Write a protein that binds this ligand. Structure first.
Ligand SMILES: Nc1ncnc2c1ncn2[C@@H]1O[C@H](CO)[C@@H](O)[C@H]1O
Length: 316
């Protein structure tokens, strides 16, 4: 036998180049470094959710990881039935449950940083608009736009953010279509926050550049710089809003493994903890740009600047 961590996805697969991938990599590192084991199951439909989480709980594993906000209901109900099983919910808040720990991220703060990068790049071409494609808007998803918009405005209040919602994290065909719509309108920079769907946005940006259009995309979850290489050397990825869901998974799995599981707590992984932000190295960002970004970053961490949780269009 061994200590086992089981992961349940709510959409797409572990090869999504972003969110599911980060979570699985984290659980995988935990396992490999501690001689433990791990496995996962994919569940695209919500009627598949409770059955997936329950089978894992029934195997009495070390920790069941619910990857994504679509799983919150199934987890609240499943964890009710299986009080002796530990559950970790990634990307949504679950409190008042001793056997549930939830990890959320200060993605508004991280997104502020790539908004600064987006605005500076847009200004370079004399653009007064930048694009934003998000997979869904439920749960904590709005934090991305709220922060992206704040970062853009911190550079130039006259630059407008144009938003498209895909209503799915697993349709790259739709991501590509929404990206073409935005680029066709004149936008030269798009921040994609759409998981698997986002891979279609990155593909459109690569196709566009090859086609002679000076466009850019900003990645998410992972450092997606290499995914954007289009001519052998250069990349269309301006930078990425990295989100260490892998560290969160790895750390909480280790806590469960060691007997220090913080049940009943919803833990925030932020900019200060370096759980969100931009990659260490950014080939497409100048030193001047990096300078401005790090300056904002320090101010947000020190709380000299508080990043909003909802964008202007979503505030009363
Ligand atoms: N398969 C998914 N299920 C739930 N949320 C997702 C999924 N893929 C991406 N996301 C959300 O969109 C963001 C950018 O991909 C992620 O950090 C996460 O918040």
């Amino acid at each position: 036998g061994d200590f086992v961590v089981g992961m349940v996805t709510d959409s797409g697969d572990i090869d999504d180049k972003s969110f599911n991938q980060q979570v699985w990599e984290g659980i995988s590192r935990f396992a490999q470094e501690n001689n433990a084991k791990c496995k996962y199951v994919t569940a695209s439909t919500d009627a598949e959710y409770v059955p997936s989480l329950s089978a894992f709980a029934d195997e009495n594993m070390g920790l069941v990881v619910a990857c994504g906000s679509f799983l919150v209901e199934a987890v609240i109900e499943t964890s009710a039935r299986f009080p002796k099983q530990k559950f970790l919910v990634i990307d949504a808040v679950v409190q008042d449950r001793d056997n549930v720990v939830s990890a959320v991220f200060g993605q508004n703060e991280g997104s502020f940083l790539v908004g600064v990068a987006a605005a500076l790049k847009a200004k370079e071409a004399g653009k007064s608009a930048v694009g934003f494609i998000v997979g869904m808007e439920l749960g904590m998803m709005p934090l991305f736009e709220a922060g992206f918009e704040a970062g853009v405005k911190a550079v130039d209040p006259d630059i407008q953010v144009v938003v498209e919602v895909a209503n799915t994290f697993s349709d790259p065909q739709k991501g590509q279509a929404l990206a073409a719509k935005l680029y066709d309108s004149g936008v030269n920079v798009i921040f994609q926050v759409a998981g698997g769907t986002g891979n279609g946005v990155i593909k459109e940006a690569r196709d566009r550049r090859l086609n002679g259009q000076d466009v850019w995309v900003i990645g998410v979850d992972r450092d997606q710089y290499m995914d954007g290489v289009y001519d052998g050397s250069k990349s269309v990825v301006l930078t990425s809003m990295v989100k260490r869901a892998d560290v969160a998974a790895e750390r909480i799995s280790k806590m469960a493994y060691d007997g220090s599981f913080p049940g009943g707590q919803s833990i925030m992984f932020g900019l200060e903890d370096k759980a969100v932000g931009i990659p260490e190295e950014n080939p497409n960002l100048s030193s001047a740009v990096m300078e401005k970004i790090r300056s904002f970053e320090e101010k947000i961490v020190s709380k000299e600047i508080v990043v909003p949780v909802r964008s202007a269009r979503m505030m009363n």
